Symmetry: C3
């Protein structure tokens, strides 16, 4: 169930969600599946922040991606109440307090723990791990492990040289057949071996 | 849909939930309120000021300690079993007091408000905050347990807002100063209010 | 219904969940929705073991299935082994067991706490609402936050040693009835003397 889930690309119909190959969601049997993860994302506008998810990601049950930016609430105005979005004739002069946050971008090979919450506009680099229940309020670096609320640095998965090797080779770009030829290396800690294998194919 | 939605006043049936005008929930709202008995007038109530914005999946914890006494041998509420063997159990329930959310409060998505907490006017509760203690007027808090982040305005601006209490004005009066309401010009709104008195 | 909820022993069918008497869940979607990723058809997986007289708040989560096949130390965390893809046939199984999750007796789990895999929580512990318990919790310890951290102990070390001797959760409901005035009190020393006289 958490090992396989169901692939996200089949579950979504919102054009503002873009997801790469093989990425899956393990909360598939709850509610409406992956769609329930995605909060406040307008499907009928092309001028809103989108949710971009790389290939080969694993999203844990109940993860939340917060979209719609500041939801019309301006902390710096007298009131956070979104007057502009009330159908009230008295409030017709209200100014739009909506502020976009930018796209939410999740890299390739990202593992998002169960019930983590990703705040608007955050970028999570390739290979990162988001602990269960983390509240990610800032960008996460490639291969970084973070947790807590607000999420904070725990560690990196690999050495800086291994990270550079992974950033050069971009194994998620290879075909499944090419990944199948080097599956013994993919399922190992031998980053150096996989880098050498990739160079010999170039 | 987080910009508006169903106003809370129209979608509650629990007499122990009292909510001011225009406050809305972007999720219904009854599912936010945990363990609140709708048939008893001797329990902690949930009081919500006007012009509040409540994010999806926020939780307001009611029913106090739920009968669990951390100072007793066991936290198991023997008193609340129908078991004849426990007939002499002592009631462990301890009320927390009303939960009181002020006017113009923004409660982030999936924040949890613990029992008996007061959240002052104009406060902002970050998404996923766990609010275990009172929050001051115009204070921003986050994390678990929630901690101080910042104040939205200076002490003198807060005092101006506490004197003018714009949420008490009619929607018609608010429309007349809407350019100011949608600005950081708190002194301008204050001078505007004084000219109307 | 936070005060008595409904008993867990009667609302479970997953044989990998083992729960003591009187323990109840106050979000009755029932208690089984609290248990995440637990395979009910295998006997070689981590089990969920819950003592008697526990109180589990609404929406608590018990994370099972260990690392769910994700090896942080491998090139990728993507569980190639669990994809039915013919190209990934030589994939190695990344699953690592965490060990059983063990909740002691007389444990209060706050609403929407999450218990990570392999964790042991001692008798008498209190888990604050929304705590994320990433490591073992000691008997009669109170923890909270994310990750959970020590707050206090409910009783002194001498009182805790007394409670670990007498193990009142082992007594019958009838015996507990005979000392209910002491059970509903802070008089640990009094309950210990009562127990000594009953032996
Ligand atoms: Cl948290």
């Amino acid at each position: 169930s958490p090992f396989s889930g169901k692939p996200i690309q089949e579950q979504i119909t919102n054009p503002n969600i873009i997801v790469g190959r093989h990425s899956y969601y393990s909360g598939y049997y709850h509610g409406h599946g992956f769609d329930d993860c995605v909060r406040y994302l307008n499907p009928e506008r092309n001028d809103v922040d989108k949710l971009i998810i790389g290939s080969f990601c694993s999203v844990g049950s109940g993860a939340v991606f917060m979209m719609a930016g500041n939801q019309g609430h301006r902390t710096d105005w007298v009131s956070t109440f979104p007057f502009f979005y009330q159908q009230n004739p008295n409030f017709s002069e209200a100014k739009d307090g909506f502020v976009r946050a930018g796209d939410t971008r999740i890299g390739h090979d990202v593992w998002i723990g169960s019930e983590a919450m990703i705040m608007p506009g955050v970028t999570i680099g390739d290979g990162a791990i988001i602990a269960s229940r983390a509240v990610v309020t800032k960008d996460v670096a490639p291969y970084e492990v973070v947790g807590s609320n607000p999420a904070k640095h725990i560690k990196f998965r690999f050495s800086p040289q291994e990270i550079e090797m992974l950033q050069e080779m971009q194994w998620w770009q290879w075909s499944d057949e090419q990944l199948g030829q080097c599956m013994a290396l993919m399922c190992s800690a031998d980053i150096e071996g996989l880098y050498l294998w990739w160079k010999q194919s170039q």
